[PDB]
Amino acid sequence: GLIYGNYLHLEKVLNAQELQSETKGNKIHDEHLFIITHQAYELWFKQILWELDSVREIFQNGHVRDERNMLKVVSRMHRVSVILKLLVQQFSILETMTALDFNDFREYLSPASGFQSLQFRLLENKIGVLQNMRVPYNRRHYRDNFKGEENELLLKSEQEKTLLELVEAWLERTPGLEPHGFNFWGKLEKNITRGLEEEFIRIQAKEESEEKEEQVAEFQKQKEVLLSLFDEKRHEHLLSKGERRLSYRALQGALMIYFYREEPRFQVPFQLLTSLMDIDSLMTKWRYNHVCMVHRMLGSKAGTGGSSGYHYLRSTVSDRYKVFVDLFNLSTYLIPRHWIPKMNPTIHKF
Amino acid sequence: LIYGNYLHLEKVLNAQELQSETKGNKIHDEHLFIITHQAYELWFKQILWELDSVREIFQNGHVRDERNMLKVVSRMHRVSVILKLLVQQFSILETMTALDFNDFREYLSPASGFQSLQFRLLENKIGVLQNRDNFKGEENELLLKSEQEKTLLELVEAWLERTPGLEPHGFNFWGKLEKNITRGLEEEFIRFQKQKEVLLSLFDEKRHEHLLSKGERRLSYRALQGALMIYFYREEPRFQVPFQLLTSLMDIDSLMTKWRYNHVCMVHRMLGSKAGTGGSSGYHYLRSTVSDRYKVFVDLFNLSTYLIPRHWIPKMNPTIHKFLEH
Amino acid sequence: GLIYGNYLHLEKVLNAQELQSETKGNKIHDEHLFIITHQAYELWFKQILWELDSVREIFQNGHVRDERNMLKVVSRMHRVSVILKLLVQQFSILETMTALDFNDFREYLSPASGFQSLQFRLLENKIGVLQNMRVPYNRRHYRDNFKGEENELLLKSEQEKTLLELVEAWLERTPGLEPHGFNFWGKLEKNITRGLEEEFIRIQAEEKEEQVAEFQKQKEVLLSLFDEKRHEHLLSKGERRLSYRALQGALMIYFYREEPRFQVPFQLLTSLMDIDSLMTKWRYNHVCMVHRMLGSGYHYLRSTVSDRYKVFVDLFNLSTYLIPRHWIPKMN
Amino acid sequence: GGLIYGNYLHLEKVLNAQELQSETKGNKIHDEHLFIITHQAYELWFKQILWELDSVREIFQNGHVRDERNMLKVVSRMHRVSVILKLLVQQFSILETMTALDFNDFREYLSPASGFQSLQFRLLENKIGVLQNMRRDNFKGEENELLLKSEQEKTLLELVEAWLERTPGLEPHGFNFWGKLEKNITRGLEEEFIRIQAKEESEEKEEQVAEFQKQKEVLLSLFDEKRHEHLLSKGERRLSYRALQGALMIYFYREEPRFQVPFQLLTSLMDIDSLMTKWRYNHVCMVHRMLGSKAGTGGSSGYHYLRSTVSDRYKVFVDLFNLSTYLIPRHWIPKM
Ligand code: HEM
Ligand code: HEM
Ligand code: HEM
Ligand code: HEM
Ligand SMILES: N[C@@H](CC(=O)c1ccccc1NC=O)C(=O)O
Ligand SMILES: N[C@@H](CC(=O)c1ccccc1NC=O)C(=O)O
Ligand SMILES: N[C@@H](Cc1c[nH]c2ccccc12)C(=O)O
Ligand SMILES: N[C@@H](Cc1c[nH]c2ccccc12)C(=O)O
Ligand SMILES: N[C@@H](Cc1c[nH]c2ccccc12)C(=O)O
Ligand SMILES: N[C@@H](Cc1c[nH]c2ccccc12)C(=O)O
Ligand SMILES: N[C@@H](Cc1c[nH]c2ccccc12)C(=O)O
Ligand SMILES: N[C@@H](Cc1c[nH]c2ccccc12)C(=O)O
């Protein structure tokens, strides 16, 4: 029958290690580590892509409408974050390479670099990084590197529906947003307004003091910020500046899911939202762990790929790269439990 | 002798007071929040204990007897193993949702991490330079002392200045290097001006001194030479464990920073753009602590800038080769 | 106004470090590491017990009947396993202590040992480690050397309903089992009998002779599932823990995990197995460290790393009865 | 005409190596992809470990280890190996996100392949120094050849052993470590006994007498070479008597500059034994959850077989662990 090595196509996987330093005369030992590490990173990128595309597809073909599929969705998104955790740890292996030893074979790498990784870009795009999110240096050089089939795939990963878009769509349909029905946004606006009013009255009742004038201008801030939730115009504007990415209505669904997460239909949807955030944090921690290491390897030296090196990479560690940055920023609009619109028997049984 | 007593659990496990409970309605997750901070502080105390012992080994002259290097490197390596665990330990508090956090957050004000003594002592003792309003009494004293007593950076500095091979009438490392790099650049020409400007700027002692004042550089010129010496000649028996040490010093900076960052990533989910109870902008202020401003041993990182081809490095004659044996 | 140090009762937490080597006249540096390491473990044991008891109570008081509470239940159990992961990794810190240095203060410890950790014992008990299944130490019972208040506390933790019993009871009410309802078990036996017969008929059509014994073993194993007396017997030998009906609920939740009412239940079951693996991995890392430090004792430890201490063995063993997807009784 | 990332790493090979048997045989099962990637990633890291380990064997085999400027390279690489194994132990957490139920949906397509047929895992076991008694029909052709070479060539065990046998300080007319250690331990015991002969008759004194006699037998058994030879023949010890002395010398005097890095080396070798068994163990915990008591595709009983690989039988460097049986109070260590 079938055999381990053949099953895993190790004729390919373990015959894929060519040390350029060797190829050009003086074999440097640690180059082998350098090569295996990147390869393992790339096997796992492939796997993440496999999970990610499968989940995207579940949204794109409508299967997500059937809630029996949510366990699968969340399991696979959570798997993506478990893999990234491993990927963030994996840097510790390459760190057993001194900059001194790296330097003995680095010259045989130029002009290649990780910038040319097709899979990393597919992953960035499929999650939903937009070109106008990318660092100046990055949004005019990332795609200018690939051709033929590879260019085709990069193109498709920007042209096809991203995780962000697909989640946005499904978030807009979140039960309870319907004005006819539960009218979440209206109640919420009502309760926050009533809530802030009571608060102001409590503060005014206070014995005129140093601490009081503090509470007032502090209250005025919280009122300014909370009420601005309901300013759809401010949202379009923030959208246009790219400080925000989700539609206004999707954002309402997300917050619906936050406040009412313990309702049975919202439990797994809430886990999904948590996973999306986790994936963003891990993606950024990857970038950040990447930066720390490149610093020790290159110092101030420019990259083999022609970027500034340590300084360019440090600018990718930034919320401009957080695809689901909104999901984090909903914590700005957290209110006291009591203000959350109460839930009646019939929308509970729903 | 009994486990509980030995460990003084009568104290350790009776130190958990949920404010939410003290003010009427106990919120479950406050307990997690308390336990996590306590574990962190226990580990801060342990790091302080390793760190002070290493500082003392430099300051009392024992680091001069090289048989103590195994002790030094191990203890420094231990600090980094603890920090590594401390970085991972945020994963526990991340099982608290922002919502649930938001249920007891009100009872915390105005306490915050800003008032953690040990974290401050740790930063000063390593050597973060100031260029405290939260502390007073015996705590304000300790803090002053930790700013005033010699830091890990100063002690390591002194020691690095005494590195074998730097003396000009001896192996004269620094003079040869300048000769070799210069021939090397010239040779390459006949076979650039950017790295040439960059390489040669290493030999500008006064440029160095300038950046020292602005603190964009941190080690003395001499200490910098010693570090470079240990990097290049790291396989020489006397340089092996010292080189491990330099590596650890850099390990500790990355871990410190990874800590600040993991902290930031979690505070971002907890607060969004809410101000911190301690009065910082929150997310944004902590974001600014993730910069080489706080990287005490930047120089060791930045020495990677000046790496050269092996051939250029001043070959070591048997005089000094033998000098560098145990 | 509230201050960090006071809030955290740091006046206690950070004043709880007495090096016995120092108290006896020669401070040995690494005893500090030894003391801090244990205090952190115990701090996390207290947290685990805190989560663990709130969850037992959610079960014991009936709240778990309201399925809105499952997210909270599963989050806390998952959180227990996240702490346990850190605790497993935490041995790496103590592994920076050499056996030679450990040897310089070991004498000052005696007769204290980990055997005396009140919290480690409460944890074992509250999850559901059975006493009559405990490997005896020094020909005696784990509770013997505890006394007074602590002894009572352990008694209570032995007698009070454990996680295992609480989950068991909830598993017995799993929707689907009822004979006059979806009749899960009845249908399962029928579908397994049909599957096997179809399987047998195909094999008729040396490498053939393998499948025959291979089938015969599987036939015997699968059909043994519907033998309740064999179950009851293995129960009493402590080789199974869950009642027969509870088992049915667990297999119900495995097979139909994607059904929305079963999604978070399935996560919980997975968490319970997680907690079992993490406890065992904790005991193993312990063992591996002792070996290097010290060279019963190390023997008793190595003997705890076994399915004797695996409170939810039944959940692992269900994997034995996995069947092809299309044998699973369909849902109307 | 320009080195490119994908060419350099030959991803034309690495990322075209994923063929789901379930897909090949008519119904694709999503999670098989994970099973495959997980295994390929382990094998890339096995290859990397082989690479490090062979280079270190060669520094011993060709004598470069005699020149102590190379010890930093030796320890760094051995340490690198345990860093890789730490990651490989952690990597199970990824496969653990596959439920047994989903695994069950494609398991049938794997028979009769198994990890028993992992060439590299066996090469690894062998080059470290796992003995064939302390335990390959699954192999053929060139692979079977490599396997045999890995059995006959010097293992890291034998190479480390020879080097231990040359540890400075052992020589009888020199520092005479062994003779001094035996003399000092004998005096130390005699004295401590006298101290016990002083104590007033009690149940306590009797417990110290009984304790003493137990220590005394263990410590003095160290200077019994014939006992060591017997145990060696049973395979309960692996190192020669002299290598044993050399390791103890390095333990006791580890802070002496010439012994600092060697000490680090001995620690790494123990690390690597520890991590291998942790690997074997996390593998066991996972396989349990997938199979229960079902027999493996490779033909073993599965969960139950793998459990028996988790034992100091497979610890190549047991002697290094067990030397801590013979720790003595610092006063007794012969001075310099
Ligand atoms: C010695 C180790 C490493 C060095 C010196 C290094 C250096 C760099 C540099 C300088 C860049 C910026 C582009 C350039 O100027 O070349 C870069 C980008 C990149 N590298 Fe690395 N790297 C290392 C390890 C790795 C590893 C292990 C991976 C794993 C796949 C990786 C993947 C990437 C990716 C995906 C980018 C583009 C990231 C972005 O644009 O946001 N690198 N690297
Ligand atoms: C939900 C969890 C946490 C939140 C929301 C949080 C939030 C914050 C914020 C906003 C600050 C800036 C000071 C302020 O404005 O109050 C801060 C500082 C700080 N926090 Fe936390 N924190 C959390 C957990 C922790 C933990 C577990 C520790 C462990 C000891 C910690 C230690 C510190 C330290 C040492 C500082 C001073 C940081 C510096 O000066 O660089 N925090 N934290
Ligand atoms: C140098 C490290 C350690 C050594 C040498 C050691 C040694 C031992 C030994 C020999 C026993 C068996 C009972 C006895 O002979 O007294 C034991 C039991 C135990 N130790 Fe450790 N231990 C170490 C670290 C730790 C740590 C860090 C913890 C964390 C709380 C711990 C907790 C325990 C527990 C809970 C038991 C009882 C285990 C059971 O009954 O299954 N130990 N230890
Ligand atoms: C669902 C996951 C897995 C299952 C069910 C499983 C099952 C088994 C079983 C039953 C055996 C014993 C031989 C047999 O009867 O087949 C075995 C051996 C082995 N497997 Fe796994 N395995 C899994 C994952 C892995 C992974 C990820 C690796 C990494 C390369 C691996 C590598 C090995 C190796 C090297 C052996 C030989 C071990 C020895 O004999 O000491 N397995 N496996
Ligand atoms: N600064 C935090 C408050 C906080 O997290 C905290 C409160 C009391 C004791 C420790 C805390 N954590 C500090 O980093 C906040 O404003 O959310
Ligand atoms: N049986 C142990 C006792 C011990 O290690 C110990 C003593 C005090 C506190 C914790 C300890 N370790 C427990 O596992 C020994 O003989 O080393
Ligand atoms: N599943 C349904 C309803 C829905 C949309 N978004 C949701 C979020 C949570 C719960 C249910 C939903 C749909 O896709 O249209
Ligand atoms: N960009 C790296 C070189 C590099 C890192 N990873 C790579 C992978 C393949 C080729 C080159 C690289 C540098 O400038 O030093
Ligand atoms: N240990 C000696 C010599 C020394 C100083 N700095 C060093 C750095 C590396 C090696 C040796 C040294 C001393 O402290 O004076
Ligand atoms: N919630 C109901 C039904 C129930 C029991 N066990 C379950 C397991 C999974 C799903 C639902 C249930 C109860 O507590 O009785
Ligand atoms: N390096 C020398 C001396 C030596 C042998 N074993 C050692 C152990 C520790 C220190 C030195 C040695 C050799 O290999 O022959
Ligand atoms: N041995 C496993 C199957 C398996 C695990 N890992 C593999 C790698 C390749 C082929 C088969 C396998 C079983 O009995 O279920």
Author numbering:
A (entry chain A): 39 to 388
B (entry chain C): 40 to 170, 181 to 240, 257 to 391
C (entry chain D): 39 to 243, 248 to 337, 346 to 382
D (entry chain B): 38 to 172, 181 to 381
Paper quotes:
TDO and IDO are heme proteins that catalyze the oxidative cleavage of L-Trp, the first and rate-limiting step of the kynurenine pathway for L-Trp catabolism. TDOs are homo-tetrameric enzymes with 35–45 kD monomers and are well conserved from bacteria to humans. The hTDO monomer has an all α-helical structure, and the helices are named αA through αL, as in XcTDO. The heme is located at one end of this four-helical bundle, with the proximal His328 ligand coming from the C-terminal region of helix αJ.
To define the binding mode of O2 with respect to L-Trp and to obtain direct molecular insight into the catalytic mechanism, we prepared crystals of ferrous hTDO in complex with L-Trp under anaerobic conditions and then exposed them to an O2-saturated solution at room temperature. We observed a large change in the absorption spectrum of the crystal after overnight exposure to O2, indicating O2 binding and dioxygenation reaction. The final atomic model, at 2.5 Å resolution, has excellent agreement with the crystallographic data and the expected bond lengths, bond angles, and other geometric parameters. The crystallographic analysis revealed that the active sites of the four subunits of the hTDO tetramer are in different states in terms of the catalytic conversion of L-Trp, giving us several snapshots along the reaction coordinate. Clear electron density was observed for L-Trp and O2 in subunits A and B, allowing the definition of the relative regioorientation of the two substrates prior to the reaction for the first time. The O2 substrate is coordinated to the heme iron as the sixth ligand. The terminal oxygen atom is situated next to the plane of the L-Trp indole ring, close to its C2 (2.9 Å distance) and N1 (2.5 Å) atoms. The electron density in the active site of subunit C and subunit D is consistent with the product NFK, allowing us to define for the first time the binding mode of this product to TDO. The pyrrole ring of the Trp side chain has opened, but good electron density was observed only for the remaining six-membered ring and its N-formyl group, which is coordinated to the heme iron. The JK loop is ordered in subunit C but disordered in subunit D.
